[PDB]
Amino acid sequence: HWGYGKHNGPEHWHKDFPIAKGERQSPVDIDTHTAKYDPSLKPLSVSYDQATSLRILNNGHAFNVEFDDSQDKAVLKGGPLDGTYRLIQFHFHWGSLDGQGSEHTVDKKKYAAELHLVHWNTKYGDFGKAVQQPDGLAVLGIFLKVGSAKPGLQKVVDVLDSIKTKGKSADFTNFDPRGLLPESLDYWTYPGSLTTPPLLECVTWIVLKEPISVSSEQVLKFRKLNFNGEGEPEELMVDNWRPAQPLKNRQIKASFK
Numbered sequence: 001h002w003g004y005g006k007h008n009g010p011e012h013w014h015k016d017f018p019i020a021k022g023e024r025q026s027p028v029d030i031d032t033h034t035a036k037y038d039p040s041l042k043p044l045s046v047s048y049d050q051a052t053s054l055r056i057l058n059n060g061h062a063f064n065v066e067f068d069d070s071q072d073k074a075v076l077k078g079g080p081l082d083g084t085y086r087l088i089q090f091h092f093h094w095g096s097l098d099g100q101g102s103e104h105t106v107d108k109k110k111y112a113a114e115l116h117l118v119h120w121n122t123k124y125g126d127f128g129k130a131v132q133q134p135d136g137l138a139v140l141g142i143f144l145k146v147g148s149a150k151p152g153l154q155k156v157v158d159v160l161d162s163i164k165t166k167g168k169s170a171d172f173t174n175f176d177p178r179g180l181l182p183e184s185l186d187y188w189t190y191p192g193s194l195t196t197p198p199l200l201e202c203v204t205w206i207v208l209k210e211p212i213s214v215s216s217e218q219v220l221k222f223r224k225l226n227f228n229g230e231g232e233p234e235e236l237m238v239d240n241w242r243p244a245q246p247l248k249n250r251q252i253k254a255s256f257k
């Protein structure tokens with residue numbers, strides 16, 4: 001099946017998922033000088049105070065921290081969005097080296113990792129319906145650079161030992177995703193897709209300008225995870241990122257100048 005290796009990675013995906021070469025694929029390079037400031041953009045509303053995390057899962061491609069999305073407890077609204085988008089999960093993409101790992105790039109610059117907080121539009125009722133819609137998803141993307149540690153990330157890195165291999169899950173309640181956000185909510189936004197198969201073109205991407213910093217020890221712990229299942233040959237979960245895709249007929253908008 002698809003993955004991130006030489007024989008099943010991003011260059012192969014189009015054979016099973018032809019939309020890989022579609023009109024609104026993600027990630028993209030954000031050319032800061034060509035992004036258009038849009039004063040018609042409302043401020044972002046991140047409402048995570050009632051967030052209820054449930055579980056953390058190694059799915060063989062990344063690890064997901066899952067939330068209760070059966071009511072409006074943690075939602076994203078405003079910005080470019082119309083309506084209410086419910087937080088379902090967050091996950092990261094990261095590199096084998098500090099100089100690569102993010103999916104979006106900024107003036108071709110790669111960050112060490114990228115956080116994706118995935119939300120779905122409540123007017124579609126469930127996540128499965130949402131991904132079939134052009135405005136079904138809103139993913140909040142946050143770059144990570146290596147430097148000082150991120151205290152709000154530590155609880156996540158300390159549980160990774162318990163989900164080392166594909167298919168492992170562990171209880172992960174009472175985690176506050178507000179601890180992963182930078183100070184500023186200045187953002188760029190563009191219409192794109194899921195960055196893994198099925199690569200559906202259902203995402204309003206909202207990528208924050210300000211990266212968060214994580215420590216070298218923190219990202220090293222990401223790199224100790226496994227793509228494989230228990231009892232299978234060890235393949236380190238690193239470089240689980242999709243490179244930048246053609247922008248084509250899209251303008252990236254900025255919330256700030």
Ligand SMILES: NS(=O)(=O)c1ccc(CNC(=O)Cc2ccccc2)cc1
Binds near residue numbers: 118128193196197198
């Ligand atoms: N990296 S990203 O933030 O763009 C990203 C990628 C994949 C997904 C998950 N998509 C699927 O698992 C498939 C699926 C389809 C229909 C019902 C359920 C699942 C979420 C977010």
Ligand SMILES: [Zn+2]
Binds near residue numbers: 091093116
């Ligand atoms: Zn992602």
